[PDB]
């Protein structure tokens, strides 16, 4: 090319967006902002393709024009807005407040919550650095930044944020023994406890967890978000991050029609 990319073929869209191979030659391409292009699902593909609030682009647009969609306590008007993990999804006209989590096949689910629950946001401490005139900053997985951070907050930990005032109230420490959920890989959406953090000079460090029924798994440290301290700080779907195997799933697919 001679510049940036604007378009996006339907087949080249991420596999977990669950698009269908017919019904167009084009796909919505996410816009830059609070999340990336691979680990996200756009606002339009949530409203129009999931909940049928709009049956088309031409009337999803106007829902976003009269400002009916609150994301992270602030409205949005861009159909291609990338919403991601832990973002808050509240539409007031239908009285629905959600948070985004992953299912146990690596897809984006909207969990119901309460007004006592939508007051905070969990972020992953991506990095600590120095800006103008020598000041510290923490930059996170949702592209938030916090200056003058309490020195106890170190890289790869988790923070709890107020959506209105934009300031830190609680923090959780990534150590051996923390309840944590994966965000990528082929164990995306599964929850366990940190029970090994194995480090390697020059190269990636690997992390080994186990669910609450004994099944164990591995991943890179880039994919281990911390949710609590032997108890989650936010809600999780009634499957709680335990994956069935293929035959158990097949019998459930048999039951739902039986």
């Amino acid at each position: 090319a001679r510049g940036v990319r604007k378009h996006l073929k339907r087949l080249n869209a991420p596999k977990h967006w669950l698009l269908d191979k017919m019904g167009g030659i084009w796909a919505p391409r996410p816009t830059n902002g609070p999340h990336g292009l691979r680990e996200c699902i756009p606002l339009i593909l949530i409203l129009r393709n999931r909940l049928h609030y709009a049956n088309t682009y031409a009337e999803t647009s106007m829902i976003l024009q009269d400002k009916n969609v609150l994301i992270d306590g602030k409205p949005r008007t861009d159909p291609t807005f990338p919403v991601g993990f832990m973002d808050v999804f509240e539409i007031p006209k239908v009285h629905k407040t959600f948070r985004v989590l992953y299912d146990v096949k690596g897809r984006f689910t909207l969990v119901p919550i309460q007004s006592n629950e939508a007051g905070f946001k969990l972020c992953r401490v991506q990095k600590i650095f120095l800006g103008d005139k020598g000041m510290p900053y923490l930059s996170t997985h949702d592209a938030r930044t916090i200056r003058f951070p309490h020195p106890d907050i170190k890289t790869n930990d988790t923070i709890k944020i107020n959506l209105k005032t934009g300031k830190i109230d609680e923090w959780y420490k990534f150590d051996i023994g923390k309840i944590v959920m994966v965000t990528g890989g082929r164990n995306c959406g599964r929850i366990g406890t940190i029970q090994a953090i194995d480090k390697h000079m020059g190269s990636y460090t690997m992390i080994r967890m186990k669910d609450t029924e004994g099944t164990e798994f591995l991943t890179r440290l880039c994919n281990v978000f911390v949710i609590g301290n032997d108890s989650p700080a936010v809600a999780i779907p009634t499957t709680k991050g335990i994956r069935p195997d293929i035959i158990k799933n097949r019998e459930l697919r048999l039951r739902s029609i039986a």
């Binding site: 200056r147 003058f148 309490h150 020195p151």
Partner: protein, 189 residues
Amino acid sequence: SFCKVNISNPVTGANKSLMTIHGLRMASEFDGAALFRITGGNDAQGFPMYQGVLKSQRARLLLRQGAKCYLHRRNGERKRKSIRGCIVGPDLHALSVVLVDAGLTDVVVPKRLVPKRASKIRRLFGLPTTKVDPKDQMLVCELILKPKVQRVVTDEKYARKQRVIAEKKEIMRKSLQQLEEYKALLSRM
């Protein structure tokens, strides 16, 4: 044709036609001998005279956006053109001329429109711009789109400005507070 001569008194206001200037160059003063100053012209085929070519014929040149003879289509377009002419020699079918040092001058063509700037109108009718009353919503205009003057300061504009101005001090108040906050954190740590 022989030589159309656009004449234009830049004072009275008048664009009149007409039908010891050979060798003359732009900005020369001929003396209304048998037909004053040359500010332009167009040889045959229409090709316009260009300033500085110091010739009595034609010369293709490369023109950038912002020069005469050049209506560009994109920002940064250049094009080569035959800007020709002469030092007011023979092959000059048509020409432009201006009367200086005045049948003859008797007509006037009014100022078609009126000023529209807050400062402008006041300096015009001998008025300052430093005493707190810049409204000046008098509407004469000889009722003749074309008013709605500009740069006229008001209460709304004044207040809004003040708002931003103050804000650009509150920012620093709380910022330099937080500096002390973090200093104390470290010092107790």
